[PDB]
Amino acid sequence: DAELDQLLQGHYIKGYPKQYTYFLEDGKVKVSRPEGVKIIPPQSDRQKIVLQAHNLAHTGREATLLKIANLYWWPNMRKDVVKQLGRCQQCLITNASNKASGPILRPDRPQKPFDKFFIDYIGPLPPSQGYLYVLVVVDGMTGFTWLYPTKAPSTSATVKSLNVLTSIAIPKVIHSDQGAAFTSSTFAEWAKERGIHLEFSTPYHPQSSGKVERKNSDIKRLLTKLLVGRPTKWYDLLPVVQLALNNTYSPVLKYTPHQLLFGIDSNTPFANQDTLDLTREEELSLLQEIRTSLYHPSTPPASSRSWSPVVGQLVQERVARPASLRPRWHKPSTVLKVLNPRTVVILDHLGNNRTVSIDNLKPTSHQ
Amino acid sequence: DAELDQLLQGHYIKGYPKQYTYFLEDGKVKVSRPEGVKIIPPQSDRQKIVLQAHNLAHTGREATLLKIANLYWWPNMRKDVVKQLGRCQQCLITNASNKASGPILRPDRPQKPFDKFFIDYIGPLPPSQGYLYVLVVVDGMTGFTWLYPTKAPSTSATVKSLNVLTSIAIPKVIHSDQGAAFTSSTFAEWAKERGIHLEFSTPYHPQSSGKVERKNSDIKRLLTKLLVGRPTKWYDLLPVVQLALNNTYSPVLKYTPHQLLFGIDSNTPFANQDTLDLTREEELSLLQEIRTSLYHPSTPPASSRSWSPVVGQLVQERVARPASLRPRWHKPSTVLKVLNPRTVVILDHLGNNRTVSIDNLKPTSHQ
Amino acid sequence: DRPQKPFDKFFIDYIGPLPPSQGYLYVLVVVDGMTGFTWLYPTKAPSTSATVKSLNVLTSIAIPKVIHSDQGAAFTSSTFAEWAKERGIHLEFSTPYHPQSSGKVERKNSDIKRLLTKLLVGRPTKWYDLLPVVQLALNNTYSPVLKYTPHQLLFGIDSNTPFANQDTLDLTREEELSLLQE
Amino acid sequence: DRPQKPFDKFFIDYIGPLPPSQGYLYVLVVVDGMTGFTWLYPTKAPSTSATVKSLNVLTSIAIPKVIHSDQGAAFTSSTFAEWAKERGIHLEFSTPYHPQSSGKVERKNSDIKRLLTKLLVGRPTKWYDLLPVVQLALNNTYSPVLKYTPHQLLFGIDSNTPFANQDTLDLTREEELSLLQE
DNA sequence: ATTGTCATGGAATTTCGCA
DNA sequence: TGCGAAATTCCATGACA
DNA sequence: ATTGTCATGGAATTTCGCA
DNA sequence: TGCGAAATTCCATGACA
Ligand SMILES: COC(=O)CCc1cnc2c(c1)c(N)c(C(=O)NCc1ccc(F)cc1F)c(=O)n2O
Ligand SMILES: COC(=O)CCc1cnc2c(c1)c(N)c(C(=O)NCc1ccc(F)cc1F)c(=O)n2O
Ligand SMILES: [Mg+2]
Ligand SMILES: [Mg+2]
Ligand SMILES: [Mg+2]
Numbered sequence A, B: 001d002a003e004l005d006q007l008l009q010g011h012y013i014k015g016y017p018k019q020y021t022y023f024l025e026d027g028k029v030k031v032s033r034p035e036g037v038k039i040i041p042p043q044s045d046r047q048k049i050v051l052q053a054h055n056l057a058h059t060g061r062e063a064t065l066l067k068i069a070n071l072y073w074w075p076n077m078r079k080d081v082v083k084q085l086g087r088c089q090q091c092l093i094t095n096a097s098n099k100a101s102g103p104i105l106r107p108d109r110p111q112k113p114f115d116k117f118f119i120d121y122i123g124p125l126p127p128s129q130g131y132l133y134v135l136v137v138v139d140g141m142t143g144f145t146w147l148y149p150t151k152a153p154s155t156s157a158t159v160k161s162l163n164v165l166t167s168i169a170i171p172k173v174i175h176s177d178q179g180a181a182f183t184s185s186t187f188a189e190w191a192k193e194r195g196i197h198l199e200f201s202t203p204y205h206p207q208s209s210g211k212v213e214r215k216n217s218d219i220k221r222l223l224t225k226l227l228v229g230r231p232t233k234w235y236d237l238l239p240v241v242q243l244a245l246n247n248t249y250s251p252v253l254k255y256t257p258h259q260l261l262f263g264i265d266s267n268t269p270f271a272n273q274d275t276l277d278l279t280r281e282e283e284l285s286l287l288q289e290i291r292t293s294l295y296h297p298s299t300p301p302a303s304s305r306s307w308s309p310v311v312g313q314l315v316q317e318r319v320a321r322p323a324s325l326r327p328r329w330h331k332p333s334t335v336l337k338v339l340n341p342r343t344v345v346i347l348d349h350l351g352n353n354r355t356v357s358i359d360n361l362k363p364t365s366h367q
Numbered sequence C, D: 001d002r003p004q005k006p007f008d009k010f011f012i013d014y015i016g017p018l019p020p021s022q023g024y025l026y027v028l029v030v031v032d033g034m035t036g037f038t039w040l041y042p043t044k045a046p047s048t049s050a051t052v053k054s055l056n057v058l059t060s061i062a063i064p065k066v067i068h069s070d071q072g073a074a075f076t077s078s079t080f081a082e083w084a085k086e087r088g089i090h091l092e093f094s095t096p097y098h099p100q101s102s103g104k105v106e107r108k109n110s111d112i113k114r115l116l117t118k119l120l121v122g123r124p125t126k127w128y129d130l131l132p133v134v135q136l137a138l139n140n141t142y143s144p145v146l147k148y149t150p151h152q153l154l155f156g157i158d159s160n161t162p163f164a165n166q167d168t169l170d171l172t173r174e175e176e177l178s179l180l181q182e
Numbered sequence E, G: 001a002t003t004g005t006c007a008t009g010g011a012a013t014t015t016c017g018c019a
Numbered sequence F, H: 001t002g003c004g005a006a007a008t009t010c011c012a013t014g015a016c017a
């Protein structure tokens, strides 16, 4: 009231333009603006007014301002509006983001076979011979794939299948998503016993297992074609599918996963016979050169309105399996470290450290 | 064999370049090409060879050719390869499309209130007072919305609610998707009795009901915020939500759906008082001008590799709810008429006429 | 003075008791003072509860600045007063035994009583389903003073149900006899 | 003549019967002729069925041009002949009572018999679980003639499990005594 | 016989207050 | 006739099962 | 503590066969 | 040294729950 007092008599106050006539009427300070006559509420009333207008439908910046501007005017209204939007907990956890993630990374292809495995489960499928799932194991360098049918995506069925697989060779690293079969301690003890380092995707981000996820597509696609018109008996087709895909050419690479693994086709149809006159040593020499000259894609252009995380920034993690009529976003969190432009550690909503993908984050609006 | 006979002696045959030496060896016609020595199978064997190479993994153009080129060579191999790909039924119905749809249409806003209603159901939701669904009715011109809670998305519950709604005014047209409540004959008889024309979206294409679908989002979003921390008792909030959204400003329009319908706010918080001195007739005069000057968006740019349908073209309809390990596409169909660049009539896989959206079609590859 | 506008004043009143129709006995009449637009709500009693329950439906569409009614018990209760205060609605009562409103509203409430009577006869227990068509008729009836229907004054457009065939609103000789028997 | 290559020839043979381990009694040995790489499959009988069932697993990874074996009944059956013809595999038999192969394969099959015996003692019924580690040892064993391990000749890389500690492969005095008791 | 839509908040652009 | 700041407009983003 | 991927078929570009 | 056609490369599209 003290500020608005000097305004009525004609003194100047910073923020209130001088060329307007501020008068009193019905016990309220008013002003004649081009849009009409508006009420100038005292400073002590402005927070409550912004709150009442926002809470009508929990509207954003402009829809809240248009309501206030129907009755009131004061210097820098939107400033006070944005101030309330950043303090409304319901809006911060329910609204969607409008900033896209930064462009994807194209991590280096593993240098050698058996450097890194990507594993994942497909299923459930129609029951075939009592089996419901398929363990898919993809060698990251070659794309060579092993298929194992199981009755459940269990740790016990994974250990059984990988014991048979690693009869041929032990990998350095196995990469899996955070499914239950792979995150149990029994699976960790099984890997530690063999010098295998376990490497896990960020949660709820299948892109990170994209190498095996993409192979899952080819597997299902070929099973679909083979089962057209027939009942979905897929158990007896897994070896057929595994061999077919392992000998299929990648048009961009000009090689099949079998060729990248062994450097020479086996007794399969249309076997390439180009190296028939070389010795095995000359063949393996040509293989090491081919393995290091493979095409590798590059990070794409960022989109017009992308965000990249900064240490100390307020961000929010996407809710995993949100119930009906429940918010899709967690309470705000602080970024602790930036491992790469697409991966961060946050101080979790519970209080723990969590390594999450940027695709499951949004920057908290209004700072 | 007659064609390949003249080749061995040295005569010229169109398609076989002259500067290469074609010889015989092991009872097979061969040629010394830069990549190596390849077999030239007679014409009568080439179809079976393309088939055998394709069927290994049902690969496309280049992956099939690379297999054949390991052993054979003949003029225009890929021509014979594409010929088989267009005859492989399993590949045509299982593979994905790689041509995007043409850009979306932005149909004209209905000229008056009650010209066209958009209706749809939300749910099921958490049970509230025994209710599970919400009938959402959106007036296309104003965005004004009516909310009715029901126990099922039934025809009987729709007729009950619309009888209460149309106590205020009868619309010309009601637009709904092809859900069961709206496609029954009981609903058609109810509409014919009232001069209401029923207008249906193309099947499995919610974009076509986009006006009410978008309102569904605002409804759920506001219900979510209001129920934070509380049990999901949404029944008593529907009137609150309906009134709140009907009086919320659209920042791009600069008006609320209530204002577009009535031309004057009611006794709600922050009621706009700009027309207090005009008569009602002067107010309605300003309302008719506002209704015809509203912003309207335009069709966006087409993408790099979009397709648009042509009469007589072979296209394929997406399978509605495809089972596991089953094709995602129907057998090819013929385009009968092009109603607009985004809607066509096809001669269905069963034999009927079907009006479908282009987003649920792909052009059949290899003609 | 400011020109009269829709939602400036709602006139409410109860019609009944009527013959039972799907368990309802009364009709809560709401008429907008400026446009003459009419809403009809069926209730089971002339109580504050039924009144609040019915007006809660209407006020989720539009809220009037003032509600006007007679001194009926449902409207003069402290419960209804608290309901009106919560929504910022001012209550306005006519003097006991001296009902007043406006010429337009008086005549509209006359039409409603007469229109209901004409369709009561022959089917006195089927009026619950007829309330929708009754409102469409009342709201698309031409006003001799304003030279516009309530639908046009409220929405600023012509209606998709123009009731050109203006009904007689008087009881024929057969209906006169048949109504008398009850 | 063309240089010898992997998958040119697979040498197969049966080892058994062994003490029962998880219901299995035999081991089907498959050795690649060029690299010396070894696959071990446990079976329940030296039958064509068990042979086909086990080779069906191997031939979903790589298919040899030729399979070589002795004239054992499981390999000379018309069923196994039809199985080999369907996959384009040529069958090649050594003369009855005159087993032959190659020096590299002879010695590899010697190592396998000896390595199994050394781990049979003490735990004769637990060899089913040891087959994986047995293959890793055999396939990462250094070859004095080729100066490369089977793993290196097949994949062209070093292995993540280099068995530098070359085992004695001979029975210690205690194992000699304990094996004799059985 | 039919057809996407629009709240949201940073950024880009225009307008305002003053000289 | 031009400047700094506020006000307004622009528009990519994402969700309606 | 971690990170998208790659078959597909029209289109765009390069190479081939011949002079 | 240049043309028409074939061969090869390019790359947006979409699906891996
Ligand atoms: C036989 O036809 C049917 O069974 C149709 C059933 C049906 C009814 N209503 C639906 C849907 C399906 C349906 N899939 C959706 C649906 O998928 N909505 C999500 C959605 C996706 C994209 C979009 F642009 C808008 C949307 F609402 C829907 O919103 N409604 O109202
Ligand atoms: C506690 O963590 C969990 O419960 C994770 C469960 C789980 C496991 N495996 C999954 C998923 C979820 C899963 N959502 C997906 C999944 O959504 N895949 C679809 C998919 C989407 C995008 C993409 F780029 C690739 C994909 F495979 C999956 O592929 N796998 O293997
Ligand atoms: Mg998984
Ligand atoms: Mg997966
Ligand atoms: Mg629907």
Ligand SMILES: [Mg+2]
Pocket (backbone or CB within 6 Å): B120, B121, B206, B213, B216
């Ligand atoms: Mg919907």
Ligand SMILES: [Mg+2]
Pocket (backbone or CB within 6 Å): C013, C014, C070, C072
């Ligand atoms: Mg009364």
Ligand SMILES: [Mg+2]
Pocket (backbone or CB within 6 Å): D013, D014, D070, D072
């Ligand atoms: Mg033997």
Ligand SMILES: [Zn+2]
Pocket (backbone or CB within 6 Å): A054, A058, A059, A088, A089, A090, A091, A092, B225
């Ligand atoms: Zn809020």
Ligand SMILES: [Zn+2]
Pocket (backbone or CB within 6 Å): A225, B054, B058, B059, B088, B089, B090, B091, B092
């Ligand atoms: Zn095919």
